[PDB]
Swiss-Prot record, chain B:
Protein name: Orotidine 5'-phosphate decarboxylase
Organism annotation: Methanothermobacter thermautotrophicus (strain ATCC 29096 / DSM 1053 / JCM 10044 / NBRC 100330 / Delta H) (Methanobacterium thermoautotrophicum)
Role played: Catalyzes the decarboxylation of orotidine 5'-monophosphate (OMP) to uridine 5'-monophosphate (UMP).
UniProt record similarity statement: Belongs to the OMP decarboxylase family. Type 1 subfamily.
Gene: pyrF
Entry's Gene Ontology BP terms: 'de novo' pyrimidine nucleobase biosynthetic process; 'de novo' UMP biosynthetic process
Length: 217, 218
């Protein structure tokens, strides 16, 4: 996946007008947008096609799929029918639940991103201790796309070691949560940035600033 | 705790509005509590919650297995309750802060949170099972009153009930299609969640009636 400027916009605004306006203001800096439930549950799944029609950007559906196999299949099918190019799936629920997603993705020509360790403090309670094994599970399952925490560079580095240089890795927690753009890109192929951009007084300048700080990357 | 008619909750996972409405309407006399998840919501929109409320006199549990960071969890819960959901199901594995975020919104908005501890599918044994007892204990410490546990593992469901106490409300999926037995599950759960056994039956109403007949003494 070729992500422009190694920067993925996490569009979590919950108003269609604002989401479209802000995304449009930074369209020259990105070509990949992560759309999650905050926007989808507020404006509907039709928003995905709207983004593709207006920006032609690739869309990653951040739905952190975490159900049983049967339900995961249905969620992925509904998501790809809406036009999403990829979907993010939790690995904690096990291999069968991930495989269900991989199957639908293959059938519809899409990609599955496996979320290993999360970026928030609570991730230390249960997820962190299982993260390395979740990553190895992804490798065993043939997963090629992963999500790891910008807030813990040492953990992000370990994830990269496990999946190898050929795998694709994206990382959230940059900016608002404390992660550094440049440091994160030492291990991740692309950084995910939400609030630092969409809540900034000038989203365009915010995006431009982040890119300037990693221009050598 | 919510008064679930016949201790039976319908897992409405059909993805077609017409079929979902037809089947739910056919079993309306047996169930007053419906669990709506992403298969239906992502196919028909959040307005489906509004339509179910209008068409049926049913309580709605939004099975969204919320599993994000605190900030995003808050937004998901707000949008879900704004749509009319009486309660929302949240994953406990992402940690205490993520669960607390949901509890805070539920408190502010006058709704309820259900904490999913262990899951019913085979894959749950890989990582969730080993953390389930602690996730449940965490829920108790956080003040969680509603929980979700697996019917497919009676021994685990029994332990979960012990951890949360008799006062807590516990609902359990995995009955029917996944192998769980209605009666045995109700030994520990306040209500059973049933999907395919009912919505894929030639006569959903007869399927629901049959399940209820088997647990009549309970
Ligand atoms: O571990 C993870 C996984 C995520 O997808 N995310 C998501 O990435 C985005 C981060 O946004 P922000 O830059 O505003 O903190 C959110 O949409 C969030 O749900 C995260 O923050 N941590
Ligand atoms: O551990 C769990 C948690 C669930 O919510 N569920 C949900 O409960 C329902 C079970 O449906 P069914 O009776 O068709 O197997 C589904 O909507 C599923 O997503 C489950 O099966 N196991």
């Amino acid at each position: 996946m070729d992500v422009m400027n190694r920067l993925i916009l996490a569009m979590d605004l919950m108003n269609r007008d604002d989401a479209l306006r802000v995304t449009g203001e930074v369209r020259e800096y990105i070509d990949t947008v992560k759309i999650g439930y905050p926007l989808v549950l507020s404006e509907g799944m039709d928003i995905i096609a709207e983004f593709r029609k207006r920006f032609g950007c690739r869309i990653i559906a951040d739905f952190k799929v975490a159900d049983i196999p049967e339900t995961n299949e249905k969620i992925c099918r509904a998501t790809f029918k809406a036009g999403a190019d990829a979907i993010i799936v939790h690995g904690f629920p096990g291999a069968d639940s991930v495989r269900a997603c991989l199957n639908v993705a293959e059938e519809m020509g899409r990609e599955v991103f496996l979320l290993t360790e999360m970026s928030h403090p609570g991730a230390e309670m249960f997820i962190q201790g299982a993260a390395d094994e979740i990553a190895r599970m992804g490798v065993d399952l043939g997963v090629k796309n992963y999500v790891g925490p910008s807030t813990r560079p040492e953990r992000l580095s370990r994830l990269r070691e496990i999946i190898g240089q050929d795998s694709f890795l994206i990382s959230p927690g940059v900016g608002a949560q404390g992660g550094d753009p440049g440091e994160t890109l030492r291990f991740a192929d692309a950084i995910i940035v939400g609030r630092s951009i969409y809540l900034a007084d000038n989203p365009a300048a915010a995006a431009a600033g982040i890119i300037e700080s990693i221009k050598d990357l």
